[PDB]
Amino acid sequence: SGLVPRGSHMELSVDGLPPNLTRSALLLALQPLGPGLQEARLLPSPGPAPGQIALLKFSSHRAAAMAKKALVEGQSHLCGEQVAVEWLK
Amino acid sequence: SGLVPRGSHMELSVDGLPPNLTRSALLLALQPLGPGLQEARLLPSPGPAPGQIALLKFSSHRAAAMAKKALVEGQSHLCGEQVAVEWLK
């Protein structure tokens, strides 16, 4: 209704982030999603469980789809609770 | 003993990765650690619990330290078990 049409698949929804995660801590963690990330909105997550949802708007569909893949791959393989990162002595 | 001195802090240890995670699945998930990543070795993790350790060798200390920060920030904030990523409708 008057608004420019939104480009399709340029914005990700990331739901169930930590309840007290700060905007600056989120943007530090999202840095590797690359220079395509334009804006971030952080709200309380809908539903019974505490959390936040982040709305991540990219400058292209290509930047957004790269970011979506990256997040999903990290989530499905690097999120082990006993994963430990250190300098190799 | 004959070997060129290793550069200091150019190699990360990532311990406690999933036991059956493949080399190709690890390298797909590590893609955002950026073009500094040169070589990856994947072994069984030492100790009582199942896992793998990945030895990640970077072309500079700058590439390695960026990669270490990125992994640690992702781990401490994006690893929630109910984190859900979708296209914003």
mmCIF file with all atom_site columns, C-alpha atoms in Angstrom:
data_model
loop_
_atom_site.group_PDB
_atom_site.id
_atom_site.type_symbol
_atom_site.label_atom_id
_atom_site.label_alt_id
_atom_site.label_comp_id
_atom_site.label_asym_id
_atom_site.label_entity_id
_atom_site.label_seq_id
_atom_site.pdbx_PDB_ins_code
_atom_site.Cartn_x
_atom_site.Cartn_y
_atom_site.Cartn_z
_atom_site.occupancy
_atom_site.B_iso_or_equiv
_atom_site.pdbx_formal_charge
_atom_site.auth_seq_id
_atom_site.auth_comp_id
_atom_site.auth_asym_id
_atom_site.auth_atom_id
_atom_site.pdbx_PDB_model_num
ATOM 1   C CA . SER A 1 1  ? 0.000  0.000   0.000  1.00 0.00 ? 1  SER A CA 1
ATOM 2   C CA . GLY A 1 2  ? 2.391  2.738   -1.278 1.00 0.00 ? 2  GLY A CA 1
ATOM 3   C CA . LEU A 1 3  ? 5.564  0.837   -0.075 1.00 0.00 ? 3  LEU A CA 1
ATOM 4   C CA . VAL A 1 4  ? 8.301  -0.287  -2.564 1.00 0.00 ? 4  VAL A CA 1
ATOM 5   C CA . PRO A 1 5  ? 8.082  -4.085  -3.024 1.00 0.00 ? 5  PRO A CA 1
ATOM 6   C CA . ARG A 1 6  ? 10.546 -5.916  -0.674 1.00 0.00 ? 6  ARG A CA 1
ATOM 7   C CA . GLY A 1 7  ? 13.122 -8.018  -2.595 1.00 0.00 ? 7  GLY A CA 1
ATOM 8   C CA . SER A 1 8  ? 12.406 -11.748 -2.011 1.00 0.00 ? 8  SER A CA 1
ATOM 9   C CA . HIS A 1 9  ? 14.709 -13.716 0.421  1.00 0.00 ? 9  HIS A CA 1
ATOM 10  C CA . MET A 1 10 ? 16.895 -10.733 1.528  1.00 0.00 ? 10 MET A CA 1
ATOM 11  C CA . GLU A 1 11 ? 16.063 -10.986 5.265  1.00 0.00 ? 11 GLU A CA 1
ATOM 12  C CA . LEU A 1 12 ? 16.721 -13.808 7.771  1.00 0.00 ? 12 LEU A CA 1
ATOM 13  C CA . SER A 1 13 ? 14.829 -14.630 10.966 1.00 0.00 ? 13 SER A CA 1
ATOM 14  C CA . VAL A 1 14 ? 17.104 -16.058 13.752 1.00 0.00 ? 14 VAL A CA 1
ATOM 15  C CA . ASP A 1 15 ? 14.792 -17.114 16.633 1.00 0.00 ? 15 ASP A CA 1
ATOM 16  C CA . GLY A 1 16 ? 15.722 -18.509 20.085 1.00 0.00 ? 16 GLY A CA 1
ATOM 17  C CA . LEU A 1 17 ? 18.848 -16.412 20.715 1.00 0.00 ? 17 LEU A CA 1
ATOM 18  C CA . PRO A 1 18 ? 19.809 -15.913 24.407 1.00 0.00 ? 18 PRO A CA 1
ATOM 19  C CA . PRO A 1 19 ? 17.339 -13.745 26.355 1.00 0.00 ? 19 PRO A CA 1
ATOM 20  C CA . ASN A 1 20 ? 19.865 -11.085 27.567 1.00 0.00 ? 20 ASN A CA 1
ATOM 21  C CA . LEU A 1 21 ? 22.197 -11.136 24.467 1.00 0.00 ? 21 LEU A CA 1
ATOM 22  C CA . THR A 1 22 ? 23.052 -7.484  23.643 1.00 0.00 ? 22 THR A CA 1
ATOM 23  C CA . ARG A 1 23 ? 22.891 -5.897  20.154 1.00 0.00 ? 23 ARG A CA 1
ATOM 24  C CA . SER A 1 24 ? 26.713 -5.375  20.240 1.00 0.00 ? 24 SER A CA 1
ATOM 25  C CA . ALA A 1 25 ? 27.402 -9.063  21.288 1.00 0.00 ? 25 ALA A CA 1
ATOM 26  C CA . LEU A 1 26 ? 25.035 -10.357 18.513 1.00 0.00 ? 26 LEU A CA 1
ATOM 27  C CA . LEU A 1 27 ? 26.679 -8.132  15.814 1.00 0.00 ? 27 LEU A CA 1
ATOM 28  C CA . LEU A 1 28 ? 30.197 -9.251  17.004 1.00 0.00 ? 28 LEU A CA 1
ATOM 29  C CA . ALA A 1 29 ? 29.098 -12.982 16.628 1.00 0.00 ? 29 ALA A CA 1
ATOM 30  C CA . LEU A 1 30 ? 27.371 -12.273 13.221 1.00 0.00 ? 30 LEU A CA 1
ATOM 31  C CA . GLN A 1 31 ? 30.551 -10.517 11.771 1.00 0.00 ? 31 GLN A CA 1
ATOM 32  C CA . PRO A 1 32 ? 31.509 -13.639 9.620  1.00 0.00 ? 32 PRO A CA 1
ATOM 33  C CA . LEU A 1 33 ? 28.095 -13.575 7.833  1.00 0.00 ? 33 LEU A CA 1
ATOM 34  C CA . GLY A 1 34 ? 30.091 -11.101 5.712  1.00 0.00 ? 34 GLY A CA 1
ATOM 35  C CA . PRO A 1 35 ? 29.751 -7.490  4.508  1.00 0.00 ? 35 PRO A CA 1
ATOM 36  C CA . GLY A 1 36 ? 26.266 -8.137  2.951  1.00 0.00 ? 36 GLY A CA 1
ATOM 37  C CA . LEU A 1 37 ? 24.617 -7.646  6.435  1.00 0.00 ? 37 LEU A CA 1
ATOM 38  C CA . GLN A 1 38 ? 22.982 -4.153  6.362  1.00 0.00 ? 38 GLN A CA 1
ATOM 39  C CA . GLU A 1 39 ? 20.567 -3.901  9.398  1.00 0.00 ? 39 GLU A CA 1
ATOM 40  C CA . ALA A 1 40 ? 19.734 -6.009  12.496 1.00 0.00 ? 40 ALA A CA 1
ATOM 41  C CA . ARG A 1 41 ? 16.582 -5.760  14.669 1.00 0.00 ? 41 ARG A CA 1
ATOM 42  C CA . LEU A 1 42 ? 16.566 -7.636  17.992 1.00 0.00 ? 42 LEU A CA 1
ATOM 43  C CA . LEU A 1 43 ? 13.158 -8.336  19.700 1.00 0.00 ? 43 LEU A CA 1
ATOM 44  C CA . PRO A 1 44 ? 11.941 -10.697 22.458 1.00 0.00 ? 44 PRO A CA 1
ATOM 45  C CA . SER A 1 45 ? 11.148 -14.092 20.818 1.00 0.00 ? 45 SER A CA 1
ATOM 46  C CA . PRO A 1 46 ? 7.440  -14.956 20.579 1.00 0.00 ? 46 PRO A CA 1
ATOM 47  C CA . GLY A 1 47 ? 6.224  -17.978 22.584 1.00 0.00 ? 47 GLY A CA 1
ATOM 48  C CA . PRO A 1 48 ? 6.439  -19.586 26.046 1.00 0.00 ? 48 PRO A CA 1
ATOM 49  C CA . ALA A 1 49 ? 10.313 -19.892 26.216 1.00 0.00 ? 49 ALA A CA 1
ATOM 50  C CA . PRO A 1 50 ? 12.673 -16.919 26.931 1.00 0.00 ? 50 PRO A CA 1
ATOM 51  C CA . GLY A 1 51 ? 14.700 -15.655 23.966 1.00 0.00 ? 51 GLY A CA 1
ATOM 52  C CA . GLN A 1 52 ? 15.222 -13.038 21.265 1.00 0.00 ? 52 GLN A CA 1
ATOM 53  C CA . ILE A 1 53 ? 14.640 -13.113 17.498 1.00 0.00 ? 53 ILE A CA 1
ATOM 54  C CA . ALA A 1 54 ? 17.029 -11.116 15.246 1.00 0.00 ? 54 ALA A CA 1
ATOM 55  C CA . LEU A 1 55 ? 15.872 -9.768  11.872 1.00 0.00 ? 55 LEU A CA 1
ATOM 56  C CA . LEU A 1 56 ? 18.963 -9.644  9.619  1.00 0.00 ? 56 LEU A CA 1
ATOM 57  C CA . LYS A 1 57 ? 18.616 -7.605  6.396  1.00 0.00 ? 57 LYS A CA 1
ATOM 58  C CA . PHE A 1 58 ? 21.231 -8.120  3.607  1.00 0.00 ? 58 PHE A CA 1
ATOM 59  C CA . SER A 1 59 ? 22.040 -5.805  0.608  1.00 0.00 ? 59 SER A CA 1
ATOM 60  C CA . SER A 1 60 ? 21.411 -8.774  -1.799 1.00 0.00 ? 60 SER A CA 1
ATOM 61  C CA . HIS A 1 61 ? 19.685 -12.173 -1.939 1.00 0.00 ? 61 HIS A CA 1
ATOM 62  C CA . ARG A 1 62 ? 23.241 -13.591 -2.685 1.00 0.00 ? 62 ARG A CA 1
ATOM 63  C CA . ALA A 1 63 ? 24.646 -12.136 0.637  1.00 0.00 ? 63 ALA A CA 1
ATOM 64  C CA . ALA A 1 64 ? 21.482 -13.394 2.536  1.00 0.00 ? 64 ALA A CA 1
ATOM 65  C CA . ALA A 1 65 ? 21.590 -16.975 1.111  1.00 0.00 ? 65 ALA A CA 1
ATOM 66  C CA . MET A 1 66 ? 25.359 -17.249 1.816  1.00 0.00 ? 66 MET A CA 1
ATOM 67  C CA . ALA A 1 67 ? 24.620 -16.083 5.417  1.00 0.00 ? 67 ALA A CA 1
ATOM 68  C CA . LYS A 1 68 ? 21.732 -18.555 5.845  1.00 0.00 ? 68 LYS A CA 1
ATOM 69  C CA . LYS A 1 69 ? 23.872 -21.555 4.665  1.00 0.00 ? 69 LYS A CA 1
ATOM 70  C CA . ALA A 1 70 ? 26.801 -20.449 6.912  1.00 0.00 ? 70 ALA A CA 1
ATOM 71  C CA . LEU A 1 71 ? 24.572 -20.199 10.072 1.00 0.00 ? 71 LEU A CA 1
ATOM 72  C CA . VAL A 1 72 ? 22.797 -23.569 9.374  1.00 0.00 ? 72 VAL A CA 1
ATOM 73  C CA . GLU A 1 73 ? 26.120 -25.441 8.746  1.00 0.00 ? 73 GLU A CA 1
ATOM 74  C CA . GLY A 1 74 ? 27.726 -23.968 11.909 1.00 0.00 ? 74 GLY A CA 1
ATOM 75  C CA . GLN A 1 75 ? 24.581 -24.945 13.929 1.00 0.00 ? 75 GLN A CA 1
ATOM 76  C CA . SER A 1 76 ? 24.412 -28.570 12.649 1.00 0.00 ? 76 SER A CA 1
ATOM 77  C CA . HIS A 1 77 ? 28.124 -29.347 13.164 1.00 0.00 ? 77 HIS A CA 1
ATOM 78  C CA . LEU A 1 78 ? 29.980 -26.901 15.383 1.00 0.00 ? 78 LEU A CA 1
ATOM 79  C CA . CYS A 1 79 ? 27.614 -26.506 18.247 1.00 0.00 ? 79 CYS A CA 1
ATOM 80  C CA . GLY A 1 80 ? 28.768 -29.379 20.472 1.00 0.00 ? 80 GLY A CA 1
ATOM 81  C CA . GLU A 1 81 ? 28.686 -28.462 24.155 1.00 0.00 ? 81 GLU A CA 1
ATOM 82  C CA . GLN A 1 82 ? 32.241 -29.914 24.745 1.00 0.00 ? 82 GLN A CA 1
ATOM 83  C CA . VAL A 1 83 ? 33.753 -28.235 21.571 1.00 0.00 ? 83 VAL A CA 1
ATOM 84  C CA . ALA A 1 84 ? 37.049 -26.604 22.798 1.00 0.00 ? 84 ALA A CA 1
ATOM 85  C CA . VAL A 1 85 ? 39.155 -24.138 20.702 1.00 0.00 ? 85 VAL A CA 1
ATOM 86  C CA . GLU A 1 86 ? 42.776 -23.378 21.708 1.00 0.00 ? 86 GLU A CA 1
ATOM 87  C CA . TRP A 1 87 ? 46.142 -22.488 20.097 1.00 0.00 ? 87 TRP A CA 1
ATOM 88  C CA . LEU A 1 88 ? 47.936 -25.673 18.965 1.00 0.00 ? 88 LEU A CA 1
ATOM 89  C CA . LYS A 1 89 ? 51.047 -25.946 21.262 1.00 0.00 ? 89 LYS A CA 1
ATOM 90  C CA . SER B 1 1  ? 66.118 -30.551 14.732 1.00 0.00 ? 1  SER B CA 1
ATOM 91  C CA . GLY B 1 2  ? 66.602 -29.446 11.073 1.00 0.00 ? 2  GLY B CA 1
ATOM 92  C CA . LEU B 1 3  ? 62.930 -28.213 10.727 1.00 0.00 ? 3  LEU B CA 1
ATOM 93  C CA . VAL B 1 4  ? 62.114 -24.521 9.919  1.00 0.00 ? 4  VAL B CA 1
ATOM 94  C CA . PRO B 1 5  ? 60.762 -22.823 13.076 1.00 0.00 ? 5  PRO B CA 1
ATOM 95  C CA . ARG B 1 6  ? 56.896 -22.864 13.132 1.00 0.00 ? 6  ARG B CA 1
ATOM 96  C CA . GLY B 1 7  ? 55.389 -19.334 13.217 1.00 0.00 ? 7  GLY B CA 1
ATOM 97  C CA . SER B 1 8  ? 53.767 -18.729 16.648 1.00 0.00 ? 8  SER B CA 1
ATOM 98  C CA . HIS B 1 9  ? 49.894 -18.859 16.913 1.00 0.00 ? 9  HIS B CA 1
ATOM 99  C CA . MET B 1 10 ? 49.197 -19.851 13.247 1.00 0.00 ? 10 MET B CA 1
ATOM 100 C CA . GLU B 1 11 ? 47.383 -23.134 14.053 1.00 0.00 ? 11 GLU B CA 1
ATOM 101 C CA . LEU B 1 12 ? 44.138 -23.770 15.988 1.00 0.00 ? 12 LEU B CA 1
ATOM 102 C CA . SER B 1 13 ? 43.073 -26.899 17.869 1.00 0.00 ? 13 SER B CA 1
ATOM 103 C CA . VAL B 1 14 ? 39.258 -27.529 17.728 1.00 0.00 ? 14 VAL B CA 1
ATOM 104 C CA . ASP B 1 15 ? 38.546 -30.514 20.038 1.00 0.00 ? 15 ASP B CA 1
ATOM 105 C CA . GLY B 1 16 ? 35.223 -32.318 20.695 1.00 0.00 ? 16 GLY B CA 1
ATOM 106 C CA . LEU B 1 17 ? 33.788 -32.155 17.162 1.00 0.00 ? 17 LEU B CA 1
ATOM 107 C CA . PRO B 1 18 ? 31.183 -34.851 16.291 1.00 0.00 ? 18 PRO B CA 1
ATOM 108 C CA . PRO B 1 19 ? 32.636 -38.378 16.090 1.00 0.00 ? 19 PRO B CA 1
ATOM 109 C CA . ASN B 1 20 ? 31.505 -39.174 12.483 1.00 0.00 ? 20 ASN B CA 1
ATOM 110 C CA . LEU B 1 21 ? 31.820 -35.586 11.040 1.00 0.00 ? 21 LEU B CA 1
ATOM 111 C CA . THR B 1 22 ? 33.459 -35.905 7.582  1.00 0.00 ? 22 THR B CA 1
ATOM 112 C CA . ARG B 1 23 ? 36.393 -33.786 6.310  1.00 0.00 ? 23 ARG B CA 1
ATOM 113 C CA . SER B 1 24 ? 34.096 -32.270 3.605  1.00 0.00 ? 24 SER B CA 1
ATOM 114 C CA . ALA B 1 25 ? 31.300 -31.397 6.173  1.00 0.00 ? 25 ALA B CA 1
ATOM 115 C CA . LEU B 1 26 ? 33.900 -29.791 8.549  1.00 0.00 ? 26 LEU B CA 1
ATOM 116 C CA . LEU B 1 27 ? 35.484 -27.704 5.708  1.00 0.00 ? 27 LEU B CA 1
ATOM 117 C CA . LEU B 1 28 ? 31.958 -26.594 4.530  1.00 0.00 ? 28 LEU B CA 1
ATOM 118 C CA . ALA B 1 29 ? 31.160 -25.399 8.164  1.00 0.00 ? 29 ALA B CA 1
ATOM 119 C CA . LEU B 1 30 ? 34.656 -23.745 8.535  1.00 0.00 ? 30 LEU B CA 1
ATOM 120 C CA . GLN B 1 31 ? 34.272 -21.764 5.184  1.00 0.00 ? 31 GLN B CA 1
ATOM 121 C CA . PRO B 1 32 ? 33.481 -18.419 7.048  1.00 0.00 ? 32 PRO B CA 1
ATOM 122 C CA . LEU B 1 33 ? 36.804 -18.605 8.991  1.00 0.00 ? 33 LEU B CA 1
ATOM 123 C CA . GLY B 1 34 ? 37.928 -16.909 5.756  1.00 0.00 ? 34 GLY B CA 1
ATOM 124 C CA . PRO B 1 35 ? 40.554 -17.465 3.036  1.00 0.00 ? 35 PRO B CA 1
ATOM 125 C CA . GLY B 1 36 ? 43.454 -17.600 5.597  1.00 0.00 ? 36 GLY B CA 1
ATOM 126 C CA . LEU B 1 37 ? 42.670 -21.342 6.289  1.00 0.00 ? 37 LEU B CA 1
ATOM 127 C CA . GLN B 1 38 ? 45.407 -23.363 4.471  1.00 0.00 ? 38 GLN B CA 1
ATOM 128 C CA . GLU B 1 39 ? 45.279 -27.014 5.801  1.00 0.00 ? 39 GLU B CA 1
ATOM 129 C CA . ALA B 1 40 ? 42.983 -29.087 8.074  1.00 0.00 ? 40 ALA B CA 1
ATOM 130 C CA . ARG B 1 41 ? 43.850 -32.389 9.824  1.00 0.00 ? 41 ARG B CA 1
ATOM 131 C CA . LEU B 1 42 ? 40.995 -34.349 11.428 1.00 0.00 ? 42 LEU B CA 1
ATOM 132 C CA . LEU B 1 43 ? 41.865 -37.041 14.078 1.00 0.00 ? 43 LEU B CA 1
ATOM 133 C CA . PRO B 1 44 ? 39.905 -38.925 16.774 1.00 0.00 ? 44 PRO B CA 1
ATOM 134 C CA . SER B 1 45 ? 39.821 -36.702 19.920 1.00 0.00 ? 45 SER B CA 1
ATOM 135 C CA . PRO B 1 46 ? 41.976 -37.914 22.825 1.00 0.00 ? 46 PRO B CA 1
ATOM 136 C CA . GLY B 1 47 ? 40.158 -38.946 26.029 1.00 0.00 ? 47 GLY B CA 1
ATOM 137 C CA . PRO B 1 48 ? 37.195 -41.011 27.285 1.00 0.00 ? 48 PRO B CA 1
ATOM 138 C CA . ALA B 1 49 ? 34.428 -39.225 25.214 1.00 0.00 ? 49 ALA B CA 1
ATOM 139 C CA . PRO B 1 50 ? 33.850 -39.818 21.441 1.00 0.00 ? 50 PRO B CA 1
ATOM 140 C CA . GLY B 1 51 ? 34.894 -36.976 19.132 1.00 0.00 ? 51 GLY B CA 1
ATOM 141 C CA . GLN B 1 52 ? 37.392 -35.558 16.649 1.00 0.00 ? 52 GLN B CA 1
ATOM 142 C CA . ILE B 1 53 ? 39.992 -32.786 16.951 1.00 0.00 ? 53 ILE B CA 1
ATOM 143 C CA . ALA B 1 54 ? 40.717 -30.623 13.859 1.00 0.00 ? 54 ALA B CA 1
ATOM 144 C CA . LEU B 1 55 ? 44.119 -28.971 13.378 1.00 0.00 ? 55 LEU B CA 1
ATOM 145 C CA . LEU B 1 56 ? 43.513 -25.773 11.365 1.00 0.00 ? 56 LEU B CA 1
ATOM 146 C CA . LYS B 1 57 ? 46.620 -24.124 9.849  1.00 0.00 ? 57 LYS B CA 1
ATOM 147 C CA . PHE B 1 58 ? 46.347 -20.478 8.617  1.00 0.00 ? 58 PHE B CA 1
ATOM 148 C CA . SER B 1 59 ? 48.696 -18.574 6.196  1.00 0.00 ? 59 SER B CA 1
ATOM 149 C CA . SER B 1 60 ? 49.163 -15.822 8.880  1.00 0.00 ? 60 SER B CA 1
ATOM 150 C CA . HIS B 1 61 ? 48.786 -15.233 12.630 1.00 0.00 ? 61 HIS B CA 1
ATOM 151 C CA . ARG B 1 62 ? 46.256 -12.443 11.615 1.00 0.00 ? 62 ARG B CA 1
ATOM 152 C CA . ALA B 1 63 ? 44.030 -14.996 9.703  1.00 0.00 ? 63 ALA B CA 1
ATOM 153 C CA . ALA B 1 64 ? 44.366 -17.516 12.657 1.00 0.00 ? 64 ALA B CA 1
ATOM 154 C CA . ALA B 1 65 ? 43.480 -14.975 15.419 1.00 0.00 ? 65 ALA B CA 1
ATOM 155 C CA . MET B 1 66 ? 40.476 -13.679 13.401 1.00 0.00 ? 66 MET B CA 1
ATOM 156 C CA . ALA B 1 67 ? 39.344 -17.345 13.012 1.00 0.00 ? 67 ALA B CA 1
ATOM 157 C CA . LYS B 1 68 ? 39.816 -18.102 16.731 1.00 0.00 ? 68 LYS B CA 1
ATOM 158 C CA . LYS B 1 69 ? 37.731 -15.030 17.818 1.00 0.00 ? 69 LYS B CA 1
ATOM 159 C CA . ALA B 1 70 ? 34.994 -15.879 15.242 1.00 0.00 ? 70 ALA B CA 1
ATOM 160 C CA . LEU B 1 71 ? 34.669 -19.542 16.466 1.00 0.00 ? 71 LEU B CA 1
ATOM 161 C CA . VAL B 1 72 ? 34.672 -18.540 20.206 1.00 0.00 ? 72 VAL B CA 1
ATOM 162 C CA . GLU B 1 73 ? 32.012 -15.782 19.697 1.00 0.00 ? 73 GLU B CA 1
ATOM 163 C CA . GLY B 1 74 ? 29.758 -18.120 17.645 1.00 0.00 ? 74 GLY B CA 1
ATOM 164 C CA . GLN B 1 75 ? 30.141 -20.835 20.367 1.00 0.00 ? 75 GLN B CA 1
ATOM 165 C CA . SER B 1 76 ? 29.328 -18.522 23.334 1.00 0.00 ? 76 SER B CA 1
ATOM 166 C CA . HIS B 1 77 ? 26.240 -16.912 21.747 1.00 0.00 ? 77 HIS B CA 1
ATOM 167 C CA . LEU B 1 78 ? 24.843 -18.744 18.740 1.00 0.00 ? 78 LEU B CA 1
ATOM 168 C CA . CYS B 1 79 ? 24.852 -22.288 19.921 1.00 0.00 ? 79 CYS B CA 1
ATOM 169 C CA . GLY B 1 80 ? 21.429 -22.447 21.592 1.00 0.00 ? 80 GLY B CA 1
ATOM 170 C CA . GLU B 1 81 ? 19.704 -25.779 21.011 1.00 0.00 ? 81 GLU B CA 1
ATOM 171 C CA . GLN B 1 82 ? 16.359 -24.047 20.061 1.00 0.00 ? 82 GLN B CA 1
ATOM 172 C CA . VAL B 1 83 ? 18.058 -21.435 17.722 1.00 0.00 ? 83 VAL B CA 1
ATOM 173 C CA . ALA B 1 84 ? 15.936 -21.495 14.477 1.00 0.00 ? 84 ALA B CA 1
ATOM 174 C CA . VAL B 1 85 ? 16.971 -19.766 11.183 1.00 0.00 ? 85 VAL B CA 1
ATOM 175 C CA . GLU B 1 86 ? 14.365 -19.169 8.435  1.00 0.00 ? 86 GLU B CA 1
ATOM 176 C CA . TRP B 1 87 ? 13.553 -16.646 5.661  1.00 0.00 ? 87 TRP B CA 1
ATOM 177 C CA . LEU B 1 88 ? 11.578 -13.703 7.104  1.00 0.00 ? 88 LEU B CA 1
ATOM 178 C CA . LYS B 1 89 ? 8.049  -13.988 5.524  1.00 0.00 ? 89 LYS B CA 1
#
